Amino acid sequence: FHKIRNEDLIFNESLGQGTFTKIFKGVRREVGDYGQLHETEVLLKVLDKAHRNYSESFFEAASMMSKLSHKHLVLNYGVCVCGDENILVQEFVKFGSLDTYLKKNKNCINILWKLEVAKQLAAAMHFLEENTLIHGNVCAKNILLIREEDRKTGNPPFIKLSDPGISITVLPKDILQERIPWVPPECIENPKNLNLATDKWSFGTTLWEICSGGDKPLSALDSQRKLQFYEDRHQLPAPKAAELANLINNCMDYEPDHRPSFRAIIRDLNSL
Numbered sequence: 001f002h003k004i005r006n007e008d009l010i011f012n013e014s015l016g017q018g019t020f021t022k023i024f025k026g027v028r029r030e031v032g033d034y035g036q037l038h039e040t041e042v043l044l045k046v047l048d049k050a051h052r053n054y055s056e057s058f059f060e061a062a063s064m065m066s067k068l069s070h071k072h073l074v075l076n077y078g079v080c081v082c083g084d085e086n087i088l089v090q091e092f093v094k095f096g097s098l099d100t101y102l103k104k105n106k107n108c109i110n111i112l113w114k115l116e117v118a119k120q121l122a123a124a125m126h127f128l129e130e131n132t133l134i135h136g137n138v139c140a141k142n143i144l145l146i147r148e149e150d151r152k153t154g155n156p157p158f159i160k161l162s163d164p165g166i167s168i169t170v171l172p173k174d175i176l177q178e179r180i181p182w183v184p185p186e187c188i189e190n191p192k193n194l195n196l197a198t199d200k201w202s203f204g205t206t207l208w209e210i211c212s213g214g215d216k217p218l219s220a221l222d223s224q225r226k227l228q229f230y231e232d233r234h235q236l237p238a239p240k241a242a243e244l245a246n247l248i249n250n251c252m253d254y255e256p257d258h259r260p261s262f263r264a265i266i267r268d269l270n271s272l
């Protein structure tokens with residue numbers, strides 16, 4: 001990972017929180033191509049000092065996303081570990097997280113938009129599966145909108161997948177339970193069961209989000225009732241716009257070995 005100096009980073013407005021992290025929009029002063037000076041918008045993820053003991057996992061996440069290069073994977077510029085800080089320096093995606101966008105733009109997102117976004121995410125996950133690289137936290141909040149759909153020029157929307165953050169393999173059990181139903185049942189049973197099939201399940205949950213105008217599945221259930229939801233083998237209800245409900249349920253198969261490959265997922269999406 002490229003080391004960025006604290007003096008080249010300016011912290012601006014807060015953009016919320018992650019798991020044991022605080023998030024800020026910022027600026028990186030840098031020498032760019034041809035020796036030109038740039039002051040570039042960046043996204044700064046800051047591990048909580050009180051949780052410094054997660055630093056390794058915190059950075060492993062980013063390392064995962066930077067192992068390979070792909071048009072649908074967020075770019076990491078580097079890290080800042082000056083002083084007592086553990087900072088990830090990431091590309092700033094103009095239009096933010098997909099769940100927020102879906103909530104704010106419900107009455108203007110049709111099935112074609114959601115189908116294109118789903119195909120793009122499936123392409124990213126197929127790229128990861130071919131490379132046998134586990135993401136571990138596919139969710140609408142970790143999908144970032146680079147470009148809005150412009151039906152006046154035919155331009156589709158364009159999305160990227162962000163980093164998964166601290167792995168579910170080291171997170172406390174109560175956080176994992178709160179992450180039902182993105183975390184698959186075999187990972188509630190044993191977080192060391194993290195596997196490629198995990199991302200197929202979570203991809204299903206993410207499709208549910210995309211089709212549900214940004215609602216969170218099972219948000220009305222507390223952690224104990226989410227646990228029991230998995231124990232009684234329930235599936236998510238079909239979204240009102242149910243065009244993708246069969247694919248959602250096929251991805252959210254309680255048998256991990258039965259979840260379809262992302263190539264079959266993509267064929268399914270293209271058939272619609």
Ligand SMILES: Nc1nc(Nc2ccc(S(N)(=O)=O)cc2)nn1C(=O)c1c(F)cccc1F
Nearest residue numbers: 015023043091092093094095096097141142162
């Ligand atoms: N890499 C990245 N870029 C952005 N851009 C962004 C974020 C929020 C807004 S706004 N005004 O709240 O709607 C506008 C632009 N986010 N981002 C992330 O990794 C990220 C994430 F994945 C989840 C949550 C927060 C994040 F910050």
